[PDB]
Amino acid sequence: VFHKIRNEDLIFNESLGQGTFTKIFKGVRREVGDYGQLHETEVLLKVLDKAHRNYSESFFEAASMMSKLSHKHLVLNYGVCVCGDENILVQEFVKFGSLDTYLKKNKNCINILWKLEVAKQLAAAMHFLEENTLIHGNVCAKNILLIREEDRKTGNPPFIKLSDPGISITVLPKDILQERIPWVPPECIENPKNLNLATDKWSFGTTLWEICSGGDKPLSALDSQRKLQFYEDRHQLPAPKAAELANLINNCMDYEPDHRPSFRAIIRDLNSLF
């Protein structure tokens, strides 16, 4: 289980937006670190809405399970603050924010090599999860954090981490799941209890589509009724203008979950493109 952090050691600063039944803030944690040195550490504070306290177990659960598995491409959770009426997840603060925003902001200069590197790193994270039979359940660009930017001057590629999934689609309202088409795969719209490792392969494809589409969100022009019919008609996403990953996107977003390729095979596919 997560380490418990006192409310007194957390300072809330600026809002950084909202998630599903959550509000997100930049903050600071006062802590004693290694060698007993005192630190004033920048943190990301994810706060469950008071009205939705009933989702608290799910809010913390998969995050907790992920945090038991240390990996260079998985987000660092420091712990939780559950003092008083608060349900707060305390995370590392990532300077450059999440990928959905970054892609839009730096659209004019993100190229195939950058995308490929980011795709490979995400696949590495997902393979690690697959090997540990741990379902993520919400792979998307919003849940990818940019730890560091590319530096051509020095040879450094960008570096990302996969963030926590938030509250599970197994407990969310049907209308939220529908809004999340096409990240939520067809079998989970049919029955949320179908959440499986194969789920993450589909969402990974949707996420590659984002990475190639400059901040665009697939099917955003479709209301929830039309998103449902999109799956009923067995449509695929349009190929991004930069189509280098289109085949992979389609191979991952397979309406047959058993046919979706392993992350090992996906990684081998990615390596062949360079």
Side-chain angles (χ1 to χ4, degrees), residues 1-22 24-29 31-52 54-103 106-107 109-151 154-173 175-192 194-224 226-240 242-263 265-273:
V1 69
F2 275 128
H3 177 74
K4 306 290 176 284
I5 297 168
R6 294 186 304 146
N7 204 344
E8 309 94 285
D9 296 333
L10 295 171
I11 295 185
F12 276 83
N13 299 128
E14 63 265 32
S15 167
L16 294 172
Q18 295 168 17
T20 301
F21 304 139
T22 62
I24 306 302
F25 301 90
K26 184 178 186 170
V28 177
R29 172 189 179 195
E31 66 182 313
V32 178
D34 287 318
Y35 314 116
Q37 323 272 44
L38 286 166
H39 290 96
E40 187 106 26
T41 303
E42 291 182 284
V43 293
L44 186 74
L45 299 172
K46 311 218 254 193
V47 187
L48 185 60
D49 290 343
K50 270 69 194 150
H52 298 296
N54 59 103
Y55 290 114
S56 62
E57 178 162 15
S58 190
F59 174 65
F60 288 130
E61 178 59 282
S64 191
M65 294 303 101
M66 272 178 80
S67 282
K68 295 173 181 282
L69 306 184
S70 193
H71 192 274
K72 63 180 188 185
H73 289 308
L74 302 173
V75 69
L76 177 52
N77 296 319
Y78 295 118
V80 305
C81 178
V82 293
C83 301
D85 63 357
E86 305 283 3
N87 288 117
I88 300 163
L89 179 62
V90 183
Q91 300 204 324
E92 65 173 306
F93 178 74
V94 169
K95 169 165 183 178
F96 304 107
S98 60
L99 216 56
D100 58 316
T101 297
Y102 192 87
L103 292 157
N106 313 259
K107 167 165 55 169
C109 67
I110 285 164
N111 60 24
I112 179 44
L113 299 162
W114 187 104
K115 294 167 44 177
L116 222 62
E117 263 297 325
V118 168
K120 284 177 187 178
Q121 286 174 32
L122 175 60
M126 299 310 302
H127 177 64
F128 181 78
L129 294 177
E130 184 164 31
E131 292 286 66
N132 282 273
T133 71
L134 190 63
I135 293 165
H136 190 276
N138 195 15
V139 182
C140 58
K142 200 161 177 195
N143 280 337
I144 298 167
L145 302 160
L146 188 71
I147 300 312
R148 66 151 202 263
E149 303 189 277
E150 191 177 63
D151 182 348
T154 184
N156 287 332
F159 192 100
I160 62 88
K161 284 191 187 191
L162 180 56
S163 193
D164 69 284
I167 297 166
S168 177
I169 61 171
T170 69
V171 303
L172 292 174
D175 60 304
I176 300 309
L177 269 48
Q178 292 181 16
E179 285 172 15
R180 297 192 180 182
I181 293 163
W183 293 268
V184 174
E187 70 272 16
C188 285
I189 294 307
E190 190 206 329
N191 187 339
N194 284 331
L195 176 63
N196 192 80
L197 277 172
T199 296
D200 291 329
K201 288 152 174 88
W202 174 286
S203 306
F204 167 89
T206 310
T207 303
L208 289 191
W209 189 101
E210 283 180 279
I211 284 156
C212 293
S213 297
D216 290 356
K217 300 294 187 293
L219 311 186
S220 62
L222 303 187
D223 62 12
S224 280
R226 280 163 165 179
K227 285 175 167 197
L228 278 176
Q229 190 69 46
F230 177 97
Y231 277 176
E232 283 295 312
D233 289 329
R234 298 254 180 157
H235 285 122
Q236 305 292 163
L237 297 182
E244 293 87 352
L245 297 185
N247 291 332
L248 187 54
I249 290 165
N250 285 331
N251 286 345
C252 291
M253 301 181 73
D254 195 310
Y255 281 83
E256 174 53 64
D258 282 358
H259 292 4
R260 298 178 195 152
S262 66
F263 277 100
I266 289 165
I267 288 171
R268 283 162 57 76
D269 256 342
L270 288 167
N271 293 339
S272 72
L273 287 164

